Amino acid sequence: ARVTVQDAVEKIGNRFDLVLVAARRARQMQVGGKDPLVPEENDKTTVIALREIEEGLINNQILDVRERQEQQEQEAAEL
Amino acid sequence: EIKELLKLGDLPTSGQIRLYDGRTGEQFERPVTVGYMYMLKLNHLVDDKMHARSTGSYSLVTQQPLGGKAQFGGQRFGEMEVWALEAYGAAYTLQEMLTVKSDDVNGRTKMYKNIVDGNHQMEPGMPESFNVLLKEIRSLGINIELEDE
Amino acid sequence: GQNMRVAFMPWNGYNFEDSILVSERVVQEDRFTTIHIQELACVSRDTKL
Amino acid sequence: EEFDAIKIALASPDMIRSWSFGEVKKPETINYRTFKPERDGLFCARIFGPVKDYECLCGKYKRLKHRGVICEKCGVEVTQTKVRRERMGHIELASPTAHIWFLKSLSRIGLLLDMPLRDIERVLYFESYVVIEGGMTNLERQQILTEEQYLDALEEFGDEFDAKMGAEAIQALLKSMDLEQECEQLREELNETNSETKRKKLTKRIKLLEAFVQSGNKPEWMILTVLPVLPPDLRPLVPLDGGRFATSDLNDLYRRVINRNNRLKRLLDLAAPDIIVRNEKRMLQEAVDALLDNGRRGRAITGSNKRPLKSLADMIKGKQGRFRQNLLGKRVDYSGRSVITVGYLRLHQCGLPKKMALELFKPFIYGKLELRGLATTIKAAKKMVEREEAVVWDILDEVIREHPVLLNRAPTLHRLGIQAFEPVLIEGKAIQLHPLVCAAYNADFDGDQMAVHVPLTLEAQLEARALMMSTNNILSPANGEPIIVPSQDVVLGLYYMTRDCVNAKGEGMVLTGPKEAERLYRSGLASLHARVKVRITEYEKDANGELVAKTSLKDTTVGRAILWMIVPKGLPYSIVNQALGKKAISKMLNTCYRILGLKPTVIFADQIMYTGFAYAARSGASVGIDDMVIPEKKHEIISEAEAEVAEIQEQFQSGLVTAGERYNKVIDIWAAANDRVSKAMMDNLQTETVINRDGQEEKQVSFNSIYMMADSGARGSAAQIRQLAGMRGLMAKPDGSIIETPITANFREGLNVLQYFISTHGARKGLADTALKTANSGYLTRRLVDVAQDLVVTEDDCGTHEGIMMTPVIEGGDVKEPLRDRVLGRVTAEDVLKPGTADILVPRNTLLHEQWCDLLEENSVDAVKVRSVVSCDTDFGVCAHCYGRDLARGHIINKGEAIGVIAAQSIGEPGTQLTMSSIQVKNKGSIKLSNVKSVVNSSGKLVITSRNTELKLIDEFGRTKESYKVPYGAVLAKGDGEQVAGGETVANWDPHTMPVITEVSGFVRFTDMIDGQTITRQTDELTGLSSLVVLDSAERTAGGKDLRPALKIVDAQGNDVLIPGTDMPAQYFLPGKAIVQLEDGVQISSGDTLARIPQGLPRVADLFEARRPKEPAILAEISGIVSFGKETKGKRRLVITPVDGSPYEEMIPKWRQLNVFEGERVERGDVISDGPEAPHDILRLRGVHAVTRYIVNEVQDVYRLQGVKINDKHIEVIVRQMLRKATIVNAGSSDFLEGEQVEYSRVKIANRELEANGKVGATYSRDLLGITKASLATESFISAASFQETTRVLTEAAVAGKRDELRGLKENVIVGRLIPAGTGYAYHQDRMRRRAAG
Amino acid sequence: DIVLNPLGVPSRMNIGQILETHLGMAAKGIGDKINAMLKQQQEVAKLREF
């Protein structure tokens, strides 16, 4: 979670992937401005992602569907 | 002679006395040796060794930060610590330590700019220390190129 | 240097590995205050401009 | 922008003119009144670019109104000044000159031209001609020519022939040659003569010709015709503050070469005498030679300061070159330094001074303060941070939070020298460091510095939080033991408070919990060491992850009860119910890690740290003069030793004892006196406490302060107390010998002047050794880390065949490391089975964690075959299953982790610490003989007639416990398979006499020994039982030396007694120094003899160097009968006659004792001559598993001597990286015997034996190189050029025209990309996927 | 006014600091007695004798 990263790996399956997925989350968590699904509780942007993958709401399989539905509805709006 | 001198001064022969803690105020379990010792103040001060550098001067030939507190130089990230980082597996920390810290003329400036804008995004670049090596080898009489895709 | 009381006892880990625990009293009476003299030079030259 | 590879080759005048933006013609650099560079000089504006960005020299076009026009007044293109760093220039040389790299580096034009370097040098210096071609048969191409015979040829033929002087002669020679003709001719004539002395040189000639043919490098380009110039900013002439100037020596070298080139150009049109033109051409050659490499060909050219000018090859090579000083190791930004002080701090925090924090993060405060809208502009924010208002601190305290910061302590011996800590802001000037990490840092608070680095991007902070945090680093990567063990104060406090006293206070009272124990101790009603009965509720997880509670009443001390409030509800109370020293604390923390996890482990470590500090302070411990007790028997022992010193001196002056025996006796008596003194002092120090409780007297463990800090292992040892109180033993003078007079005094009593002077010798010796040998240790670590760059785990299971055997270390003496820890963490290779047949625990692969180790040790298994790195079949890396579980984590290692670097660091870290007749059974067991040629002596016992036999001790379980060595011709007092106890001398043999005992019994008549030619008549003067004596070649007559004197066994009828069961005749040959014991006519029985024949850090760094020992043990690569042929011609020859195969003739030394004789039979890979074994021979004869075992054992011996434990998988990975080259014996796809990487041979034969082809591929042979040779011989020249011998590797790369796929870690580090390890592995796999699909 | 680690003595083997500490204690004790009897000014003769 905040001091250790033990239960993240079981949700992830690897250690070197947790940094990648956490950075990928924090990217649009900080510059995208989208509300984190884990609460705030006075934390930083790089650790709320770690807590979210601690409770394991997001996964790489589902990390790539909500970003394609949004663009497809964008193009539907354009056309 | 030490024992006789301590006896003369009305002091314990063993040379240790009981002390009481200043915080809680109870006697320590065992007698503690206390006396007068000649301390020395050495020239290794702390403010003379205190140093820190965010962004300052850069060397001329190789475009890397200088060294030394006197000229406001950055710390040397030697090759042993590079070995340690690549042993950890932290490739991104190494990449920033080799490119946007010292030898990316257009890399460090934009890293500054986007850090000020609150976006800690990385934009790699070709280190200048490699460009000087390429120009040096190329000027030695042996062709060196990069096989682009 | 100077000479003052000294006790050989571990104190809450503040002398963990050759560290020294020092007083406020020794600071109050300036038993180790030192004076340093520095010289700074300003040079005026005749540039072509 | 993005590229794939780096291409290196030679450069001809074509693209070397293409690079240039102009040609320099003037030696002038810059004007002296103004400071604008002159036209077509070394700093010209047209050639290299404008001095000021977007501004010409005049000013007709400026201010971006014109983008890149060329000012017609001057000719400088208006653009940036950055381009001035990349613009090139060229110099047209009047006479061609020779490149030095392809002239002096060994020769690269000597091989191409086949002519020696001496002749090339003679021609180049204008001393001798060479015939380019000759139309007559008298002269011949490539023939040297002196001036006199040149004139003779001129007056004889004139224009028919052609000879020339100078570098143009070499250029003409290179133009004349055609590579195809040599290619087709040398290869066709190679196979006629198998002269191995020339096979290598013609093979390398063929290889060079192939390289030139398919590399596209025309050999004319080797001789320089046009020379490039470096861009001006890379050789800057910049003004200094005091109106002075500074420039690189490259400006001097360029000025010299172009001055001489212009002078040569002027001389040519002057029609000057040929000697002056030749002198000028030679001067140009020397000037260019010095420019490319100053001190290489002749004398080094010095500047005005009498120091050699550095060439442009001097500043890319060596320690100070670009590779090591500017590419691998780089200055860094966002960093600071400060002294190190102690912390109350938590394990994941570091104390960062507030004054440094605002400086390090300054852009972060700028950005955050702009975001808060507090200052309108960034310059306003700079003003605020310059005023240090309260707002900047109110921003800092939340800028730093959750932002990890790295801490570095040079030298970083291992991976733990860099750790990431969560900063906490402190009012001060020094870095506060958590004491628990000091051991990993190898840092003490005696003025040591600390380097601080702040990661910037999200990826860097996340990596610091996930991998670099001190909480993550608990176990060392070298081996599984933890690295956060409390060092000195914590252990002293815990040891002090986990004690007992006989009548201390409140003894025997019964308490209902640890809480009231603590309240009792605090109130002062109970002592800290008091045997009390405490009701203790402990927890156990016998259930499937559930904790069960059992409440029991136990007798213990108050301090042990107080500890129980710290143990984290998962450990037995028996782990706290002892004295709790250093080893106990380490093992209890390890158990807390293995049972509970990580978070309980770090919480526990911090809590025991806090309690240890607090109770060490509460206790109060000091060192005083009275604490160092002195035995009352010290002076008695000294006087008693001096008594025999005097008696030995009087015996020496009597003359009945010589110097050596007197020396040994006095050394022995002084050592005995020292041991007696130490025993007395320990006896007086360990239980000096005599106290009484409701009785008469009872003796307990001492509470002496020095004993408290020695027993607990906090500081010092029992060996330090000996010289603290007893005598200071013996010391040695610098020559090595030991002074006989000891330091009878100690430090409590002080030392004489003489004693102090004597001790200073050893003090200085040790200090110099420490100051010296760690440089070699660092060099060794760098060499080790160089070869193991590319070791990154790539697959999970390569699915390889059998791996390597594993056996304990029972050999020599007692068992040092059992099978329990030598296989912990490995993966099996076969279905290893329990001693009960058909009982299998592993399906050919499993992780041998603790449960499997317990199951194995419960059974009587002694041999397990595990999967090793050397056996891995993965190409370009290793698979995870062939490695084993990670040691820093304990689970199976995951893909992408760089194992070579951690291996090299782990085995290079302890380099500093390692600066320096009869057989008796010990325990009950079975006397087992392995590979024994048994025979019965005359006394009915069992005697041995072989050298390949070993003594084994087998217990009732079956596993071997003790191993011993028995030589050939020894006598055993017991038979095979005898159940006996220890303490019995079983084997007896003469260490000097080597017998030739005959296995058969029969009549012994003197055969084939004729006196006067091979033997001499010598009889014993006391016994009378003597026979003819056989001496060596140097002592026997050469007349009978043609035949070796053989004493065969005969019978009454006179026929040879053959081997029982075999038709081979049985006869014995007598080498030198063989005196026959029995006389003629008498016979011997079985087992009786015929004749009696009388008889550190570099130590490990040489193993990785694969150094050949001075006296290697020569072995045989094929079985059969060994014989001898040629005799006494420089050195004796040996003949091998196998049953059906060939003859083998090799070289053997006759002055070294052998193992077999003319009539004996030996097998492949057996010892014939004694001596240290060469690793190359071990690889050649026996398998790679044997050499890996040999290297691993020999290295591990050095570390076990110093008590340093390193996992064996960190040695065999480097050994695996050693075995990367291969030599081919067959053909089909490559040359006849060229060297080639083994994995390339595997991928070659991966289709020649697959369906792609029936059988064309060639078979290879494994080849072992030293660590340095292995490092330099790599397919990527960037890795090699950044290590050592940069000039040689760059020359080889240039001629061969190699390219790098940028696979290694160091290559990407140099280029600046992501390293292919960890996260970079996940990036490079995607890159490979993109490249594969196009 | 200074607290020092006792553990730094034995392994480091610099015992002279303990003897120096005992001498310092003795010397300061003599000085304290002299100063105490000087504050009262018993007699010049008594000071001379001590």
Side-chain angles (χ1 to χ4, degrees), chain C residues 8-10 12 16-17 19 48, chain D residues 35 445 487-489 617 621-622:
Chain C
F8 286 141
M9 55 158 316
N12 280 254
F16 164 68
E17 186 126 52
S19 283
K48 45 178 44 59
Chain D
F35 294 97
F445 304 119
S487 90
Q488 53 204 50
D489 272 343
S622 289

Side-chain angles (χ1 to χ4, degrees), chain D residues 304-322:
Chain D
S304 161
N305 43 6
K306 325 304 161 185
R307 323 182 66 259
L309 300 186
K310 73 179 314 181
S311 307
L312 72 173
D314 287 47
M315 46 149 89
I316 66 166
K317 82 183 212 258
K319 204 160 156 50
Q320 299 294 324
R322 292 287 174 269

Side-chain angles (χ1 to χ4, degrees), chain D residues 532-602:
Chain D
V532 297
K533 290 193 186 303
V534 184
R535 166 180 294 158
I536 287 278
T537 300
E538 55 200 277
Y539 283 71
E540 156 68 49
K541 47 165 63 174
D542 51 355
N544 324 68
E546 288 89 9
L547 280 180
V548 304
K550 46 183 306 308
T551 306
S552 175
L553 202 151
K554 325 201 161 194
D555 35 28
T556 174
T557 87
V558 180
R560 298 170 182 165
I562 282 173
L563 267 285
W564 191 243
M565 323 180 33
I566 305 293
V567 170
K569 306 202 79 31
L571 318 179
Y573 194 31
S574 302
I575 207 167
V576 183
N577 219 359
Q578 42 169 322
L580 216 55
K582 177 93 155 302
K583 315 263 202 39
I585 283 152
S586 296
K587 101 177 321 303
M588 98 174 207
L589 215 165
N590 220 24
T591 58
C592 179
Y593 187 108
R594 305 309 188 166
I595 316 311
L596 286 152
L598 189 50
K599 291 161 295 320
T601 281
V602 59

Side-chain angles (χ1 to χ4, degrees), chain D residues 279-501 504-505:
Chain D
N279 187 32
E280 186 71 55
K281 289 172 176 176
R282 155 162 72 243
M283 260 170 34
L284 197 36
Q285 171 66 64
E286 201 255 349
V288 176
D289 255 333
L291 163 65
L292 300 187
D293 212 338
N294 202 3
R296 176 152 271 288
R297 219 263 293 274
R299 212 169 159 73
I301 286 177
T302 83
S304 161
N305 43 6
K306 325 304 161 185
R307 323 182 66 259
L309 300 186
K310 73 179 314 181
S311 307
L312 72 173
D314 287 47
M315 46 149 89
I316 66 166
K317 82 183 212 258
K319 204 160 156 50
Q320 299 294 324
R322 292 287 174 269
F323 274 102
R324 300 179 78 203
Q325 198 76 2
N326 286 118
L327 260 303
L328 300 172
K330 214 168 291 184
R331 287 280 176 175
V332 84
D333 229 324
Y334 303 87
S335 62
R337 199 176 191 83
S338 195
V339 314
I340 271 291
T341 197
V342 76
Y344 84 103
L345 212 63
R346 303 177 79 194
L347 193 137
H348 59 87
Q349 317 201 288
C350 71
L352 189 68
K354 201 158 49 58
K355 198 99 193 84
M356 255 167 67
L358 72 87
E359 172 56 289
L360 289 181
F361 299 87
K362 181 183 307 301
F364 290 40
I365 310 77
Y366 289 168
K368 191 72 173 67
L369 184 154
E370 284 255 11
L371 173 137
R372 296 262 276 269
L374 177 56
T376 87
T377 178
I378 171 173
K379 274 182 133 253
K382 145 162 171 162
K383 301 296 149 152
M384 319 191 74
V385 308
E386 269 205 337
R387 304 202 217 292
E388 280 108 310
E389 328 200 326
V391 291
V392 315
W393 320 107
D394 183 18
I395 293 166
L396 243 195
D397 40 340
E398 56 87 21
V399 156
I400 64 177
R401 63 151 307 144
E402 316 221 324
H403 187 189
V405 160
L406 325 175
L407 278 193
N408 189 3
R409 199 262 196 198
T412 88
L413 261 305
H414 59 310
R415 196 192 69 182
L416 270 307
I418 276 279
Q419 315 208 24
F421 293 104
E422 181 154 309
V424 75
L425 266 199
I426 58 160
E427 189 89 353
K429 273 302 191 65
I431 308 283
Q432 292 201 341
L433 191 67
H434 192 274
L436 272 199
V437 317
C438 269
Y441 274 147
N442 186 13
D444 40 334
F445 304 119
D446 68 331
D448 303 334
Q449 305 276 24
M450 204 60 111
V452 66
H453 304 286
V454 50
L456 296 191
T457 197
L458 265 60
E459 293 90 14
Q461 304 171 4
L462 271 179
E463 286 184 330
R465 183 156 302 265
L467 308 105
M468 281 189 204
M469 267 289 181
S470 55
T471 79
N472 299 122
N473 294 326
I474 290 308
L475 324 175
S476 156
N479 43 347
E481 77 271 7
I483 210 147
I484 57 173
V485 301
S487 90
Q488 53 204 50
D489 272 343
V490 184
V491 300
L492 164 70
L494 300 179
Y495 172 88
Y496 172 84
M497 97 185 177
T498 49
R499 290 311 286 292
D500 43 340
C501 319
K505 177 64 80 67

